[PDB]
Amino acid sequence: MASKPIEDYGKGKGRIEPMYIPDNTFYNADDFLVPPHCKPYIDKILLPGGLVKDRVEKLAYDIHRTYFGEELHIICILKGSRGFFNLLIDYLATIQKYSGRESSVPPFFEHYVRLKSYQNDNSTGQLTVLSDDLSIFRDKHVLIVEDIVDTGFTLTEFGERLKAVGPKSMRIATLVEKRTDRSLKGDFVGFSIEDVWIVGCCYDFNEMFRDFDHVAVLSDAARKKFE
Amino acid sequence: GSHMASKPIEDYGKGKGRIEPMYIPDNTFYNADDFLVPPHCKPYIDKILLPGGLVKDRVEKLAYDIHRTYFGEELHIICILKGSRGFFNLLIDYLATIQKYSGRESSVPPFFEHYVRLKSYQNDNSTGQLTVLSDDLSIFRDKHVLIVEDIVDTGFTLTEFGERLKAVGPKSMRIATLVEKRTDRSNSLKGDFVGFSIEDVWIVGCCYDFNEMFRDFDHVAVLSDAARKKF
Amino acid sequence: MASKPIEDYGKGKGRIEPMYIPDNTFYNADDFLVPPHCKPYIDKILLPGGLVKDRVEKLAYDIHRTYFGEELHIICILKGSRGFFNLLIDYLATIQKYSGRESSVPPFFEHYVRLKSYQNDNSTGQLTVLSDDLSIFRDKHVLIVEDIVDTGFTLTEFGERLKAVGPKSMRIATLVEKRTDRSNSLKGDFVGFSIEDVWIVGCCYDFNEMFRDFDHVAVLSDAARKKF
Amino acid sequence: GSHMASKPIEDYGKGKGRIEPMYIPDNTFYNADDFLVPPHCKPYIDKILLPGGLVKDRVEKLAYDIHRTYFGEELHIICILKGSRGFFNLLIDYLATIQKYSGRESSVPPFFEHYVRLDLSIFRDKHVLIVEDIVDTGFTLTEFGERLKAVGPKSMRIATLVEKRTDRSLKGDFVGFSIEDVWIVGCCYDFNEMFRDFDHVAVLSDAARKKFE
Ligand SMILES: Nc1nc2c(ncn2[C@@H]2O[C@H](COP(=O)(O)O)[C@@H](O)[C@H]2O)c(=O)[nH]1
Ligand SMILES: Nc1nc2c(ncn2[C@@H]2O[C@H](COP(=O)(O)O)[C@@H](O)[C@H]2O)c(=O)[nH]1
Ligand SMILES: Nc1nc2c(ncn2[C@@H]2O[C@H](COP(=O)(O)O)[C@@H](O)[C@H]2O)c(=O)[nH]1
Numbered sequence: 001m002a003s004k005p006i007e008d009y010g011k012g013k014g015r016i017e018p019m020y021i022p023d024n025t026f027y028n029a030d031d032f033l034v035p036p037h038c039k040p041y042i043d044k045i046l047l048p049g050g051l052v053k054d055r056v057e058k059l060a061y062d063i064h065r066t067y068f069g070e071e072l073h074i075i076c077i078l079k080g081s082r083g084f085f086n087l088l089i090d091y092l093a094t095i096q097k098y099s100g101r102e103s104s105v106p107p108f109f110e111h112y113v114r115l116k117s118y119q120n121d122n123s124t125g126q127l128t129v130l131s132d133d134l135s136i137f138r139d140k141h142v143l144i145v146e147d148i149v150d151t152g153f154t155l156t157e158f159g160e161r162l163k164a165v166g167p168k169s170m171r172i173a174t175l176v177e178k179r180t181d182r183s184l185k186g187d188f189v190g191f192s193i194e195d196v197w198i199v200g201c202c203y204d205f206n207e208m209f210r211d212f213d214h215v216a217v218l219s220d221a222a223r224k225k226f227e
Numbered sequence: 228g229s230h231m232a233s234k235p236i237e238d239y240g241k242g243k244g245r246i247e248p249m250y251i252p253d254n255t256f257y258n259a260d261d262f263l264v265p266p267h268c269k270p271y272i273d274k275i276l277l278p279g280g281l282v283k284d285r286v287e288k289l290a291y292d293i294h295r296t297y298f299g300e301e302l303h304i305i306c307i308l309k310g311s312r313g314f315f316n317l318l319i320d321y322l323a324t325i326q327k328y329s330g331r332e333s334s335v336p337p338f339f340e341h342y343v344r345l346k347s348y349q350n351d352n353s354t355g356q357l358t359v360l361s362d363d364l365s366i367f368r369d370k371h372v373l374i375v376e377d378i379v380d381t382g383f384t385l386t387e388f389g390e391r392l393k394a395v396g397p398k399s400m401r402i403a404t405l406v407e408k409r410t411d412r413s414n415s416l417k418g419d420f421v422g423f424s425i426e427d428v429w430i431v432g433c434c435y436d437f438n439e440m441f442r443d444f445d446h447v448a449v450l451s452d453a454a455r456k457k458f
Numbered sequence: 459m460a461s462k463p464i465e466d467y468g469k470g471k472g473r474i475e476p477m478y479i480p481d482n483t484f485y486n487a488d489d490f491l492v493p494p495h496c497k498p499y500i501d502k503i504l505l506p507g508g509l510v511k512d513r514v515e516k517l518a519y520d521i522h523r524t525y526f527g528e529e530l531h532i533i534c535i536l537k538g539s540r541g542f543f544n545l546l547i548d549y550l551a552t553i554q555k556y557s558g559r560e561s562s563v564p565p566f567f568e569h570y571v572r573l574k575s576y577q578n579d580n581s582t583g584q585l586t587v588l589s590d591d592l593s594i595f596r597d598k599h600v601l602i603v604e605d606i607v608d609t610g611f612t613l614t615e616f617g618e619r620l621k622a623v624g625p626k627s628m629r630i631a632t633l634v635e636k637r638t639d640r641s642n643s644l645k646g647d648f649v650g651f652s653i654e655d656v657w658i659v660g661c662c663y664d665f666n667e668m669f670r671d672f673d674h675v676a677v678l679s680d681a682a683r684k685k686f
Numbered sequence: 687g688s689h690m691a692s693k694p695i696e697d698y699g700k701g702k703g704r705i706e707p708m709y710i711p712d713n714t715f716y717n718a719d720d721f722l723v724p725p726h727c728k729p730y731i732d733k734i735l736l737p738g739g740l741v742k743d744r745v746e747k748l749a750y751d752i753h754r755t756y757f758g759e760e761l762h763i764i765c766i767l768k769g770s771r772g773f774f775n776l777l778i779d780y781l782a783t784i785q786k787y788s789g790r791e792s793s794v795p796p797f798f799e800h801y802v803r804l805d806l807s808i809f810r811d812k813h814v815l816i817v818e819d820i821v822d823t824g825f826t827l828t829e830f831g832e833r834l835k836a837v838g839p840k841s842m843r844i845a846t847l848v849e850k851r852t853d854r855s856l857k858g859d860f861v862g863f864s865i866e867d868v869w870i871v872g873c874c875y876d877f878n879e880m881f882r883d884f885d886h887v888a889v890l891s892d893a894a895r896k897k898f899e
């Protein structure tokens with residue numbers, strides 16, 4: 001199951017659809033443990049931390065099955081928090097420890113890549129991305145992990161830089177994808193949500209939600225407190 | 228309810244002053260294909276009522292609520308004896324972690340865990356077996372007691388046991404349960420620390436089961452016709 | 459492989475030996491998190507709780523290798539929330555959830571049993587606890603789980619009762635065994651630690667509820683025995 | 687015997703007033719057969735130095751010690767981007783659980799996490815805890831410490847999982863273990879990715895070393 005044409009990157013072709021969270025749908029914050037300093041800025045919860053963990057477990061099972069028997073290289077893109085990647089790796093490590101333990105099944109490799117914005121030399125002057133050297137990914141099966149997909153610009157621009165070194169396959173894992181006017185889709189996606197700005201778990205806003213372990217929409221009270 | 232430790236014995240089973248459980252509306256479910264389900268349970272499960280991670284987040288919040296109610300007090304927790312998957316094991320895990328990291332409360336006796344059976348449990352002294360109480364409840368005289376139960380459907384087991392416990396004169400009596408079913412029955416028993424309020428349906432998964440069919444199913448669901456038919 | 463002659467019960471034949479803890483060998487209690495109320499009764503620690511967890515993970519793996527692909531019935535000699543059986547089952551459940559053959563092997567069964575034949579105390583909706591009738595184990599592969607083996611009399615007696623219903627195989631898992639001065643003394647098949655003959659508290663073990671929140675294992679002190 | 691945040695800056699690297707680390711005597715090991723080890727690692731692992739569970743129990747105790755020292759104060763924790771983030775991640779995990787279940791009695795802003803390469807203005811007048819996987823020569827923390835002192839923090843302490851008894855120097859304030867002068871791998875340390883899925887700590891064998899050097 002690990003081979004996939006390079007031209008299918010960003011299409012989510014043949015993927016298992018994410019959990020769908022309908023528009024303006026939430027849980028009551030009073031039903032969950034929330035930090036006392038965040039209470040004044042949170043009244044509703046989008047994704048409970050426990051529901052995030054159940055979907056990340058399922059994505060790790062889906063990933064382990066797609067690459068079983070193959071050497072896998074997982075890239076952690078350094079945008080915002082490292083939260084989602086850490087949780088995903090923890091479950092993949094546990095599954096690896098038992099499923100397929102009896103073989104010369106080489107364990108997965110982890111890699112950390114940084115990005116920097118760059119203005120190309122063309123008549124539009126539009127932005128793109130510059131990466132760390134990626135030559136080590138030649139002829140490898142690569143999984144790129146990103147906290148959330150919003151416009152899809154980061155993974156589109158990054159994707160072209162990685163295509164240039166000729167990897168064997170390229171897929172995307174992300175915790176959330178937004179339904180927006182704002183095209184690129186992931187292959188292993190946790191949730192599909194409405195077009196709103198979220199915080200909590202691996203997301204933040206000026207460190208105000210650094211100890212909040214559930215996902216919520218950024219409120220006007222938080223924007224105000226801060227600004 | 229919660230809050231102040233002391234509470235009139237007469238309020239047992241009324242859920243007075245409690246923090247209301249998470250409300251799960253009638254006929255509301257999740258897609259089983261979004262979660263990890265054992266292959267052998269798949270023919271019997273199309274929809275999930277409560278994902279296992281949602282169950283754990285609610286148990287964490289109930290452990291918080293309980294700790295705040297009994298802050299600075301000696302607490303006796305009576306667990307209706309269940310197996311490894313019972314609700315009391317997860318609740319105790321969270322209460323033990325909160326207790327271990329509450330440094331300012333080191334002078335308060337840590338909680339005491341007790342096991343009860345609802346029929347006469349016989350034993351032999353000093354033979355190292357588990358101490359399970361049944362006929363003699365005298366150790367609870369003048370103590371703060373919390374009874375922990377997997378689910379309140381009719382609650383008759385808790386009403387009958389509660390009348391026996393009252394006769395020894397405990398200082399306070401409260402109930403913790405993961406799930407309470409909605410009923411039109413008047414004056415039905417209610418818990419004080421309740422995880423979820425659900426429609427009156429029969430559930431399996433997590434601490435619940437039906438002829439061992441869902442012994443490794445880590446989410447809660449309504450017992451289906453195909454599973455009822457398998458027997 | 460799951461097969462094993464019934465007469466080999468209690469011999470520990472063909473086992474993987476347990477981790478050996480030498481005589482008078484301890485860790486400093488100041489290096490670990492200990493409940494303040496227990497601090498006056500604990501100066502040395504025998505087994506840190508994380509060392510207990512690493513050995514339980516290894517035992518679970520050993521058990522999974524022995525019974526892979528077979529129908530397994532695990533007997534918990536009744537204990538509460540801190541019993542060794544709960545921790546063992548947590549790791550066995552994880553290996554089972556990710557075993558590699560989750561559609562082609564039957565998941566294990568858990569049973570709750572009393573040591574002696576008392577009158578059943580069962581009722582509808584309550585935990586099934588077996589006492590007087592052990593007949594469900596006829597022709598089954600059975601694993602009996604106990605917190606610790608000292609003299610071995612408990613498991614010898616219970617063992618004779620289970621042999622009367624004719625199980626397919628019988629093995630024993632225990633966290634600790636004691637190095638007592640006997641010959642032909644019962645021993646387990648999946649054992650966490652071999653320790654010197656001393657009386658222990660902490661984790662699944664206790665002494666008059668004094669170590670109910672103590673998550674490491676230690677020897678029982680005279681200060682502790684004095685109090686009570 | 688103190689658990690208080692204030693501390694003179696000139697005490698940085700001296701380990702003054704610390705709780706000594708667990709002492710692991712020279713030539714003391716555990717049998718590797720008593721633990722779960724990845725099959726591909728087995729031929730390179732002669733014996734184990736520190737079981738993963740022993741590491742976790744020591745990190746939990748360090749986290750408890752850290753929480754008491756800064757209780758009620760705003761704390762800024764720096765993860766030095768040198769080697770693996772394994773030790774920092776485990777330490778933060780325990781500190782976060784203690785914080786979530788500790789004093790819901792107001793104020794005390796929860797701790798902050800920061801990642802530094804190898805600019806510092808944000809640490810002026812702050813309580814700072816610098817986290818490093820292991821201390822060998824002490825050169826990394828001596829150099830970085832002089833740059834941090836320049837911005838004028840309120841206090842500066844160090845947390846590290848292991849310190850080595852090298853040949854006759856910098857010491858941390860919250861230290862897991864004291865070991866002999868050997869090169870280690872596994873759990874939160876690695877060598878050419880060879881021990882990436884190994885959950886316990888061992889000494890790097892010459893067979894492993896010679897595979898790359
Ligand atoms: N906190 C937070 N960050 C977001 C959100 N949507 C996008 N981002 C950030 O913006 C980055 C760029 O996403 P893009 O628009 O390129 O797809 C993401 O990697 C993420 O860090 C959001 O809703 N909340
Ligand atoms: N599996 C399952 N057991 C239930 C359900 N409702 C009640 N029970 C069983 O009935 C017992 C006593 O119910 P109670 O008296 O507390 O309403 C519970 O401890 C539980 O084992 C249900 O929906 N599913
Ligand atoms: N707390 C504690 N209980 C023990 C110890 N040794 C034996 N036991 C208890 O004594 C029972 C009988 O052990 P036996 O001598 O029959 O093997 C065990 O099941 C256990 O409950 C010990 O060192 N500490």
Ligand SMILES: Nc1nc2c(ncn2[C@@H]2O[C@H](COP(=O)(O)O)[C@@H](O)[C@H]2O)c(=O)[nH]1
Nearest residue numbers: 768769821822823824825826869870875876
């Ligand atoms: N894997 C491993 N890395 C070490 C060891 N000793 C030192 N290092 C690496 O060397 C870096 C600098 O140590 P220093 O000599 O500056 O104290 C550490 O942060 C760590 O990444 C060791 O025994 N094993």
